[PDB]
Design a protein around this ligand. Structure first.
Ligand SMILES: O=P(O)(O)O[C@H]1[C@H](OP(=O)(O)O)[C@@H](OP(=O)(O)O)[C@H](OP(=O)(O)O)[C@@H](OP(=O)(O)O)[C@H]1OP(=O)(O)O
Ligand SMILES: [K+]
Ligand SMILES: [K+]
Ligand SMILES: [K+]
Ligand SMILES: [Zn+2]
Ligand SMILES: [Zn+2]
Ligand SMILES: [Zn+2]
Lengths: 193, 129, 255, 264, 45, 235
RNA sequence: AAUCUCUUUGCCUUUUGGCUUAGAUCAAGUGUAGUAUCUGUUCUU
RNA sequence: GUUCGCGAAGUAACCCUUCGUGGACAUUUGGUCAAUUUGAAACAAUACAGAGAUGAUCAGCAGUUCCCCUGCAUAAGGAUGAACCGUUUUACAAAGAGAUUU
RNA sequence: GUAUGUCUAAAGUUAUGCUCUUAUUUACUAACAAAAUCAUUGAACUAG
């Protein structure tokens, strides 16, 4: 559907116009499923129109909250370390491509290139023993029938040493205020008042 | 949901009723129309009035409607669209409003500022004020 | 007979012309598939393709599938499917005319829907209100690449190129107008011949300009108006009376 | 919206038909207004789809099938039906059709019957018209080209001729009837006829075909009791044989007419 | 003749009503029956 | 396709979703090509999305490493008001832009505690959430807006548009209703109405000028009708 | 008993079709040109 | 194809192997749509002209219309969006006078 | 200077006294026009 010169595309052209009203939804689905810094690549299920008018990412980015908190914490530490140690952090230019440059063909220019390393903070063999083997997976423990309800990825159940390891990895982003009196006159109701 | 088309000019008053004709309307085209709302057509066109039928009033105790144009008040049976009575409205001029109470008193408010009270069944004008 | 062989591929798929027309403006409109921001005097062009009845005709999948409609591209000499075509690849004849009878009232022999009114230029599919069997042959000048030719020779060439497309009722060349009228026996053959001869060239391999055939604009084959000639008009009325007589028998038989 | 007016001939002889209904699916060919489209197939395996091309209102006004526009009772075109009713009623009934889009729209909204739809919609009058139709049913260079035309010579066994000259052609005769009758005689052929000349020429594929043609009965050939006369034309012909312009063809036709009237 | 009427599974990207458009239309008046005007009954104006 | 169906071939949509005329447009071309907020908002959303996808593409090509990718994405999500014109067409989006600026402030000062100024903060999750929530509410709005635009493309514009009584029409509509009422009262009192109402227009001009309005030979009841309606307009 | 023309009466028969801040303000100009126009003189009549 | 049952050949006989044969399983896609001229998109280009109420320059807001365009639009804009400007004869009678006619 | 409107003209063939010469007065219109006092300066610029 690159060039729809032939008359055979007359119906597909109308389908393209018809897909425009749903384009914001497709954009949301694409963006909410964006790969996180610890993921090199991410396969997503998509629902596509047979004329090629539109492609919707058809899945929800479900995560285990203490795991996701630890993943972002490890990323946070790795990023601070990289900014500290890199003498020249060359920020990339925007937009990345010229206005005249047509979008690259995935299968011809991207699919064959070996992906670069993601942001993976080096975990310790012993202090992170319980988390090291799976922390940076796309959907950690999705196949472990003991830790997760199943590939639908809806419920999780962890052991004490794993929760301890996630809590410890999360220190930069986790909440540290255990005393409820900390919020005296600094809580929802006092703001309402 | 429904638009009733038929009048040839501005509509002055509309009255709803519980059964066919469920809508009764009066117009500047000098007619009173009884409508079949489901069909969207007039059940009956009453053409006796010479001038704009400004005012109408449903009788609260019987299935009849009063209507008026200058110097002309008439009563109509709604079950069949039949002329019931011609009131003694002579020389009362433009009538802006009609009202009927449960005691059969019909009130006609003149644009000249005269209050006319009539006996609904006979059409007799019993008071001018 | 065509029924003895399989249809021949007239033009290979790779040889087909690209769907993008010749440039006549600054920008190609990707919706309408037409050039914009410009103007031209005459957009017509001579058809690079031509039907050859004796050579191209043959069986297609349509014959086995029980297809009724003829192939539009076959008529134009440019069908790339050959024997695998879904539509019929031969000149319409009485047997197919008979099978088309119930649809021919509203569809042409190609299965295209007829209109209530003719185009203001009389081109196109044609009206369902008239059983028009007569074609108008204009553009003879361009079809001959402006070769000076005598009226009888023009008439002979038209008779040759059209008689091979079905049974002919009559042909007339009007030199006073440099236009021809071809009347067919069946409407489906007039429809088919119209599509086949549209934009064609009247030149022959015995002509000087044969190599320049595609320079100008081709033959303009359109539907013919009502013939004003009283001599034709009276035989038209006699045909109407014959058709009505032949129909009253069917009415009295049915009822 | 009343059900669609589709005839038995369009539905076909199949036991059951599946019909797809699409509200506002199409623009009526007659009135240009939108209508509920119905499309179906005579059989699930048939290769064609039959669609209602006109709305129920236009079909009802004309008493015709929505799928083929033939009369719903007589199953014939509107034009022929209106002529057949004209022949018996003498009233000369006709279905006039609007040209302007606004008028087409306006006309389609009238609750009336157009042309012969009056007669054909009421079966009583249709029968009462079939009976009456039964009573109708039972009841200048010619001086040069005349030496190019073979008129001096005769129809003969001996001379082998692949080409022939035809004259006394009535203008009613189409070309295909002439080719067809010659085909019948030969048990199966380039024909030129100029109807303004009322003559023509016939050229065969090879000499044995012409010899077989001359073997069957200046000679004569029959077309519905029109007596086309035939002469062997040894000198080859072309379209120029009958004149270069219309006036020459007409003059040639008058000359041939008086020659025929002398021959008879 | 028994016809089984079924609704088409429309493509959600295409217009649902192909024939739907904005069209001005002048409708005719149906003069089926006469409605009597029953009107039963010096220079100041 | 939408641009070309409208016949605007003189407008070129760049691959970065910029829309520019390819020549100087006539006033009629300018008026006809005046695309609305639904189109422009959709285009700016496509521009934002392409910026993000292109950054990931740069990483997959191997042109930028994962830290430059994270920082680039965070930069994009924090600079939407600079990298796109989205605020032009839906100015309420400034709330999202402000939220992202505020998040950057709290994030950077947490992140940079012992690092100082410079690129490198790739914690894009909060700004990313802000834009996802923006889309949640933009979806029904654009579905309606674009659906209407495309409906006009296929079906054309409605012929039965009823103009409302806005401030710019109040006097004109008031005049229409006043004249209709005066005419009704006069015609019903009498045993060319447009000529009679000229006296109403004159009585209003007389009232405005404080000139006494008096027409010799005018019927007394009609004078009283005009006078009361003039007083109602005056009030 | 039937024409024609007068005069009166009747008919008004090409017989003023909205709105706001009278909707608002302005009405001093060189050269050359364009269009219309003015006095005079012969000429036309 | 698979599988259940039966005949048979191979084997000393089973397992297994092949040829034959019956049953079970699985059961009607798709098109309102064909691929450049002839069933319909428009702008633009060349020329001339340069916006209603005016002596002059202008803000407007409406209405009527089988004209609509832009716009998400019941907002607003499009020269006050445009068109509006022409043509106009009979419910025709009463009273009276002076001339015309048998 | 606009808005905006109009034009674009073969062929791609459908059958049969009252005036005149001419020298002025007056009005209206002109995005036509770099106009001499009050070490070189209105200067390419204004539209519903
Ligand atoms: O203007 P400043 O007071 O110097 O602050 C700047 C500024 O941020 P804000 O103006 O939004 O507060 C930069 O943002 P931009 O001007 O580019 O929009 C930001 O750099 P980024 O582009 O990475 O956002 C930079 O951050 P950095 O600390 O890395 O220099 C930050 O500096 P400070 O907030 O630390 O003063
Ligand atoms: K101007
Ligand atoms: K204005
Ligand atoms: K305006
Ligand atoms: Zn084919
Ligand atoms: Zn219709
Ligand atoms: Zn039918």
């Amino acid at each position: 559907h690159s060039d729809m010169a032939s008359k055979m595309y007359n119906t597909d052209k109308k389908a393209f116009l018809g897909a425009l009203k749903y384009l914001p939804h497709a954009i949301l689905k694409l963006l909410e499923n964006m790969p996180h810094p610890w993921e090199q690549a991410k396969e997503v299920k998509v629902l596509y129109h047979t004329s090629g008018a539109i492609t919707f990412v058809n899945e929800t980015p479900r995560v285990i909250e203490p795991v996701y908190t630890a993943q972002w914490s490890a990323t946070w530490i790795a990023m601070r370390r990289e900014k500290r140690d890199r003498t020249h952090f060359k920020r990339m230019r925007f937009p990345p491509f010229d206005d005249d440059e047509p979008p690259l063909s995935y299968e011809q220019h991207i699919e064959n290139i070996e992906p670069l390393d993601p942001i993976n903070l080096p975990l310790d063999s012993q202090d992170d023993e319980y988390v090291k083997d799976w922390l940076y997976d796309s959907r950690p423990l999705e196949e472990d029938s003991k830790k997760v309800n199943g590939t639908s990825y809806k419920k999780w159940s962890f052991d004490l040493p794993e929760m301890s390891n996630l809590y410890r990895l999360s220190t930069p982003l986790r909440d540290e205020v255990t005393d409820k009196n900390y919020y005296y006159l600094f809580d929802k109701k006092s703001f309402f008042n | 949901v429904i638009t009733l088309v038929g009048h040839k000019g501005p509509i002055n008053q509309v009255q709803c009723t519980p059964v066919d004709p469920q809508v009764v309307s009066s117009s500047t085209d000098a007619t009173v129309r009884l409508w079949d709302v489901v069909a969207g057509k007039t059940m009956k066109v009453l053409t006796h009035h010479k001038r704009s039928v400004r005012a109408t009033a449903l009788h609260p105790k019987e299935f009849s409607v009063a209507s008026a144009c200058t110097d002309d008040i008439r009563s109509w049976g709604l079950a069949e669209g039949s002329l019931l009575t011609n009131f003694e409205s002579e020389k009362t001029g433009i009538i802006n409003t009609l009202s009927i109470n449960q005691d059969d008193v019909l009130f006609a408010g003149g644009d000249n500022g005269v209050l006319s009270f009539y006996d609904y069944k006979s059409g007799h004008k019993y008071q001018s004020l | 007979s065509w029924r003895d062989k399989s249809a021949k591929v007239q033009v290979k798929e790779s040889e087909l012309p690209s769907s993008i027309p010749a440039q006549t403006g600054l920008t190609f409109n990707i919706w309408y598939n037409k050039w914009s921001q410009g103007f031209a005097g005459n957009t017509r062009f001579v058809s690079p393709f031509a039907l050859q009845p004796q050579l191209h005709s043959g069986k297609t999948r349509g014959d086995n599938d029980g297809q009724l409609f003829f192939c539009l591209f076959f008529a134009k000499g440019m069908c790339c499917l050959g024997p695998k075509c879904e539509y019929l690849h031969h000149i319409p004849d009485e047997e197919d005319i008979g099978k088309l009878a119930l649809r021919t009232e509203v569809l042409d022999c190609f299965g295209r829907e007829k209109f209530a009114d003719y185009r203001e230029d009389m081109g196109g599919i044609g009206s369902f209100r008239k059983k028009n069997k007569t074609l108008y042959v204009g553009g003879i000048d361009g079809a001959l690449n402006s070769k000076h030719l005598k009226p009888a020779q023009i008439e002979s060439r038209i008779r040759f190129v059209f008689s091979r497309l079905g049974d002919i009722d009559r042909i007339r060349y009007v030199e006073s107008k440099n236009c021809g009228f071809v009347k067919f026996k069946y409407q489906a053959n007039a429809e088919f011949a119209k599509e086949a001869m549209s934009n064609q060239t009247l030149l022959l391999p015995s002509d000087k300009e044969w190599d320049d055939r595609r320079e100008g604009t081709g033959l303009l084959v359109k539907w013919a108006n009502e013939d004003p000639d009283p001599a034709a008009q009276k035989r038209l009325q006699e045909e109407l009376k014959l058709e009505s007589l032949n129909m009253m028998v069917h009415l009295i038989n049915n009822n | 919206e009343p059900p669609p007016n589709i005839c038995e001939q369009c539905l076909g002889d199949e036991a059951n038909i599946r019909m797809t209904k699409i509200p506002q699916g199409s623009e009526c060919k007659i009135c240009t207004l939108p209508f509920t489209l119905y499309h179906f197939k005579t059989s699930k395996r048939s290769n064609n789809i039959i669609k209602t091309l006109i709305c129920v209102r236009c079909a009802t006004q004309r008493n015709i099938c929505q799928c083929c526009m033939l009369d719903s009772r007589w199953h014939i075109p509107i034009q022929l039906r209106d002529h057949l009713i004209s022949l018996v009623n003498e009233e000369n009934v006709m279905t006039e059709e609007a040209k302007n889009d606004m008028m087409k729209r306006f006309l389609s909204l009238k609750n009336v019957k157009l042309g012969g739809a009056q007669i054909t919609s009421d079966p009583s009058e249709a029968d009462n018209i079939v009976d009456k139709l039964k009573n109708i049913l039972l009841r200048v260079d010619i001086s040069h080209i005349l030496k190019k035309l073979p008129l001096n010579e005769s129809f003969l066994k001996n001379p082998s001729t692949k080409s022939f000259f035809l004259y006394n052609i009535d203008a009613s005769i189409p070309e295909w009837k002439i080719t067809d009758t010659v085909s019948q005689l030969l048990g199966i052929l380039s024909l030129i006829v100029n109807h303004k000349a009322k003559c023509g020429g016939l050229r065969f594929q090879s000499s044995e075909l012409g010899e077989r043609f001359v073997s069957k009965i200046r000679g004569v050939l029959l077309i519905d009791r029109f007596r086309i006369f035939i002469i062997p034309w040894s000198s080859g012909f072309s379209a120029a044989s009958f004149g270069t312009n219309t006036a020459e063809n007409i003059k040639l036709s008058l000359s041939l007419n008086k020659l025929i009237q002398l021959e008879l | 003749h028994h016809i089984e009427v079924v609704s088409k599974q429309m493509d959600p990207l295409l217009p649902r009503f192909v024939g739907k458009k904005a069209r001005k239309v002048v409708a005719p008046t149906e003069n089926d029956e006469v409605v009597p005007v029953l009107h039963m009954d010096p220079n100041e104006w | 396709l939408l641009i070309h169906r409208k016949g605007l071939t003189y407008l070129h949509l760049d691959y970065n979703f910029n829309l520019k005329p390819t020549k100087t447009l006539t006033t009629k071309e300018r008026k006809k090509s005046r695309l609305g907020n639904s189109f422009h908002l959709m285009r700016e959303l496509l521009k934002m999305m392409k910026l993000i996808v292109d950054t990931h593409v740069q990483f997959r090509l191997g042109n930028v490493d994962a830290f430059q990718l994270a920082d680039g994405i965070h930069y994009i999500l924090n600079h939407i008001g600079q990298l796109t014109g989205i605020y032009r067409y839906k100015y309420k989006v400034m709330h999202q832009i402000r939220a992202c600026k505020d998040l950057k402030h709290i994030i950077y000062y947490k992140f940079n505690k012992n690092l100082g100024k410079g690129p490198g903060c790739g914690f894009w999750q909060p700004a990313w959430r802000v834009w996802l929530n923006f889309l949640r509410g933009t979806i029904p709005l654009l579905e309606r807006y674009i659906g209407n635009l495309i409906t006009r493309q296929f079906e054309g514009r409605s012929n039965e548009i009823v103009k409302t009584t806005t401030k710019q029409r109040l006097d004109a509509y008031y005049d229409l209703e006043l004249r209709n009422s005066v005419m009704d009262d006069i015609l019903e009192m009498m045993p060319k109405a447009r000529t009679i109402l000229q006296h109403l227009s004159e009585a209003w001009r007389c009232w405005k000028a404080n000139i006494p309005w008096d027409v010799p030979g005018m019927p007394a009841p009609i004078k009283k009708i005009i006078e009361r309606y003039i007083k109602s307009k005056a009030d």
